[PDB]
Amino acid sequence: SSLWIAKTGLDAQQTNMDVIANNLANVSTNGFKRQRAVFEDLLYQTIGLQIGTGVRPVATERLHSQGNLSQTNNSKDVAIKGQGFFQVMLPDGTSAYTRDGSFQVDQNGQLVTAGGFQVQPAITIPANALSITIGRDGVVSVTQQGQAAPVQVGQLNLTTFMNDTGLESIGENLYIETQSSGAPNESTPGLNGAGLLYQGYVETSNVNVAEELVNMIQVQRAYEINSKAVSTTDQMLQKLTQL
Amino acid sequence: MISSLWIAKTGLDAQQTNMDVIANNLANVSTNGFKRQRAVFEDLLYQTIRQPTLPSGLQIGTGVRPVATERLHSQGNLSQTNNSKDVAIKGQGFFQ
Amino acid sequence: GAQTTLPSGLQIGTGVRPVATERLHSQGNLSQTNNSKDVAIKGQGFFQ
Amino acid sequence: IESQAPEKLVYEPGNPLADANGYVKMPNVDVVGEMVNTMSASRSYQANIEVLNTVKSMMLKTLTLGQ
Amino acid sequence: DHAIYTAMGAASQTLNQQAVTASNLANASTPGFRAQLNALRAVPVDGLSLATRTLVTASTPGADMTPGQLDYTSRPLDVALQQDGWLVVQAADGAEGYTRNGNIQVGPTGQLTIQGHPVIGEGGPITVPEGSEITIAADGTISALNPGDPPNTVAPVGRLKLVKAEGNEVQRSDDGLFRLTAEAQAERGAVLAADPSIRIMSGVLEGSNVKPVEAMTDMIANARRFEMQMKVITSVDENEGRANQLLSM
Fold first, then answer.
1. Which site among A141, A159, A203, B20 is 20 to 30 Å from C36 CA-CA?
2. Is the separation of the CB atoms in E240 and A30 below 8 Å?
3. Interchain contact, E197 vs A92, CB within 8 Å
4. What is the residue-wise DSSP string for chain D?
5. Does the distance separating the beta carbons of E196 and A3 come in below 8 Å?
6. CA distances for E20 relative to A194, A242, E23, E222, angstroms
7. In this complex, how many residue pairs, one in chain A and one in chain B, have their CB atoms less than 8 Å apart?
8. At residue E82, what are phi and psi to the nearest 5 degrees?
9. Is A17 within 8 Å of A219 (Cβ atoms)?
10. Residue C25 to residue E200: CA distance in whole angstroms
């Protein structure tokens, strides 16, 4: 009856918390964009008056706003100033896209992500490297002993999407292209709308804290009100059954 | 059950891993030739709710996990010990 | 039954039962006791 | 007859019986109306029973007219 | 007289639903549990003359296949699967089965078993070098490190058999292990091939997907329906008691 409406209401508020809890758990994650749940009411029944049916979440939109930078003396970490995604080769063979700028080198040269996934285009670092320079425009140069000039290696090309909110979150700090975010556009950082690169800095999470606390306050109070609604409907049905 | 306790627990575990790294770095301030550790955090799998094309999909997170702990191999400062058996390295290299 | 429509049938469960309680054998932290008789095992081993 | 009322719609897209929009159809059975109908049917049933019981004595007493 | 049975059936089947709901709530902490969905279906009685009698019967259209909240336990053998993924384990009767419980244990002789079921990889059940720090990669690659030896070893051993199959194509067996349906068996073969596109996370255990809001609403609805059917039964019984005096001449 009116129980199948408060049930949808309760589902909505638990979805809101699962979004808020996800945002609060990823405070220390580098390059994390906060999710925001969007709710929509269901079909109305017309007999004229209109009787509602409940609420249904539509799509959690993520905010692609540039977070703050934090300084780590590591020379393998870079941060993006603007919109753009580093391209990463998955074990299957398809390409994912990430904003976590914490990179390493694996045993065969080569820049990889924190989970060891390779970063494309592939940038092979020599063993006799003394200092690695990742420039403003993505030029990765290496200094070698004796040489009075640095040896160029490669370009860190950034991928720009037309709609960044439509990317599918794999999980492990990777976004993959979807129908709503097709046609990834490779570009040198600084041109064709791509952002620039800062070496030695890591982008921090976008999540604002006070907003999430107030949001949990609101979610808890709405959840309590909906539980009261369920209790009142149950009590009415219990009174009816005694007839 | 379905409850944001299993997400906030991973949040607490992540912050505790960070605090463990911080404490380990603090305990070794006087150790000679120690590289500071940094914890890299990356969130868990995302559950996708299938809807009856859409500009954005409905995806709910699950938490965060520590995956990579890095040691910064940067050249630390030199301190003078008049003991003649002590040596220091200018650059990358390890004694065997 | 023989199959647009939902599947029929009725498979009622029976309940829950604990099968095995496991101990996580991960190395713990070390606490310093200056007495010369306590030692701590660095790895996978037990005293007999 | 089968009632012609808006079938109740519940958003359950995972159900195989959900339409393109995902609303499974639940019956239009109202609870209060059916309890009232049960009570009214019971009281009409009992009233007709009482009518038959009342008539019965007169029926049996009619047949004593001849003998 | 038979209207006292129709309502009775509903009441009885109400209890059935309650049992199912309890079976869900008893498994609130079970790892990799898939809550069974319950649904009443109406069956009309066909025959002359006025079709008035329509009974109910409860059924369980499979399980709810939304992945639960993950539990981060720092154990490398614990695995959590990408949505719509299954581990393949040898069941009791020497046949394949699919499970979500990723709590893998190592036997004394090195056999990988989940809940006593030996896990099956690409080459069959897995034999682990007795005593080894097992590390599972993101796609199921198993690396074994033998104690005492150097760490430049971490030689790989095998790869788990991860299967993609949606909730419509799978039915539960009486042992709690899921299998393919007859239609899905006909359309996708008997034994499913391992999909390399399924990602598996090591060090996290997946919990159950029992929604408590749904359980509470189901209990309230079941209680109210049971009371309504009891009231109908009482009304019918009283009516028949009054009606069974007519027979007195």
1. B20
2. no
3. yes
4. ----S--EEEE-TTSTT--SS-EEEE----HHHHHHHHHHHHHHHHHHHHHHHHHHHHHHHHTTTT-
5. no
6. 55, 26, 5, 12
7. 125
8. -65, 155
9. yes
10. 23
